[PDB]
Amino acid sequence: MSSAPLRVYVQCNPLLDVSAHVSDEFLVKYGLERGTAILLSERQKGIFDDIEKMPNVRYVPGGSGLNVARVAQWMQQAYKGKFVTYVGCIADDRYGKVLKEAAEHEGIVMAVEHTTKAGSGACAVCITGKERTLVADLGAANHLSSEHMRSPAVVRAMDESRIFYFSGFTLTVDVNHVLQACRKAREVDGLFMINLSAPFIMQFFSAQLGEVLPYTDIIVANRHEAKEFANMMKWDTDCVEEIARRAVSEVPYTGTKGRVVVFTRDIESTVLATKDGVETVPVPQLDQDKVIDMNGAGDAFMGGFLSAYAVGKDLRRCCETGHYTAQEVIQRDGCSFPEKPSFSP
Ligand SMILES: Nc1ncnc2c1ncn2[C@@H]1O[C@H](COP(=O)(O)OP(=O)(O)O)[C@@H](O)[C@H]1O
Numbered sequence: 001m002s003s004a005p006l007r008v009y010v011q012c013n014p015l016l017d018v019s020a021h022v023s024d025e026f027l028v029k030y031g032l033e034r035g036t037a038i039l040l041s042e043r044q045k046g047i048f049d050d051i052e053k054m055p056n057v058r059y060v061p062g063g064s065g066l067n068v069a070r071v072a073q074w075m076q077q078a079y080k081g082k083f084v085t086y087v088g089c090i091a092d093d094r095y096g097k098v099l100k101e102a103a104e105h106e107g108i109v110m111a112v113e114h115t116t117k118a119g120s121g122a123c124a125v126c127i128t129g130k131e132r133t134l135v136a137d138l139g140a141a142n143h144l145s146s147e148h149m150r151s152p153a154v155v156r157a158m159d160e161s162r163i164f165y166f167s168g169f170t171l172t173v174d175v176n177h178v179l180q181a182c183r184k185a186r187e188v189d190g191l192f193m194i195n196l197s198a199p200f201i202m203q204f205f206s207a208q209l210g211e212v213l214p215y216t217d218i219i220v221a222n223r224h225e226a227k228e229f230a231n232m233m234k235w236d237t238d239c240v241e242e243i244a245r246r247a248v249s250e251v252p253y254t255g256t257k258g259r260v261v262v263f264t265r266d267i268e269s270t271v272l273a274t275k276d277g278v279e280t281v282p283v284p285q286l287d288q289d290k291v292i293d294m295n296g297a298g299d300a301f302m303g304g305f306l307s308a309y310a311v312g313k314d315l316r317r318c319c320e321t322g323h324y325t326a327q328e329v330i331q332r333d334g335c336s337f338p339e340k341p342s343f344s345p
């Protein structure tokens, strides 16, 4: 006794994850802070050659938004092809084919661009225990064009979608692509949703972020991203609850659906805020010995949240569905799931 889900539009940078186990000395050798994500810089030249030379290196389709889409689609398997559409840029190369084929196999409509200006993007993922440390080399993802955003497939997708999710990571590419979707979302009275993605977005891309927030109905982030957001806004506060409250009322909002703020906190309760106050949603207890892979927990949470939102569940239940999905993924190496969910939103 379930609904068919509303159509969702997702946009991010499709990246192939190149993964390997690594010491702390290695992190420091390339100037990395453990458990964080950055964009490839000079300081990290050679890191891909170094990782590829290691044993049991894996090549796995990734990308934050793409993981979100896959998790959402996994929660709605009866609706392969009829649910999520994803937009990004790849190249027609080994990596690109892997990415496109995996997503399509799972039922995601890949409205992706193909460029020749660069090879399909990749992310170096450095495993140290349960923690992953990420270095993203966007390549082709960084060349997503206005032509592609004005194309028939994308405009049909936008026109027929009710829920729009962009990762914060898209802000490093071209803010105008994001603003175009913000406007279509308003045109159709849809929902626009964003992820803060990483502290560096607040530090180095606050201007771009600032253009998009007024259109953003739902803002999602984790504990660290929230503190960094407060720092960007110059808010003198040490509380995730207070930061969410201010994100509701003191961050400009030009929408009508109602601004909502969702901050996850790993083991601790998720903070959920609206103009009617601030609520917490407990995270079900889980034996930490079953927790194998912290990476992508946020992406999985997002997927659960969207899959519930698209069948019309209330916010609290959307967070509960997100907890369920995030807790499945962290119990497995990689972005991996049972055949079918055991949870009905
Ligand atoms: N160690 C853990 N034990 C149980 N659940 C976890 C754990 N870490 C994360 N989760 C689940 O994943 C969700 C997202 O986790 P969080 O770490 O806040 O996101 P991110 O991957 O952005 O760091 C949490 O709200 C929680 O439901």
Ligand SMILES: Nc1ncnc2c1ncn2[C@@H]1O[C@H](CO)[C@@H](O)[C@H]1O
Residues within 6 Å of the ligand: 012, 013, 014, 015, 016, 017, 037, 038, 039, 062, 063, 064, 065, 067, 123, 134, 135, 136, 169, 170, 295, 296, 297, 299
């Ligand atoms: N800058 C980025 N843009 C898009 N995806 C990213 C970026 N940095 C890391 N990722 C993705 O984040 C995921 C972890 O949640 C990895 O699957 C990785 O591919």
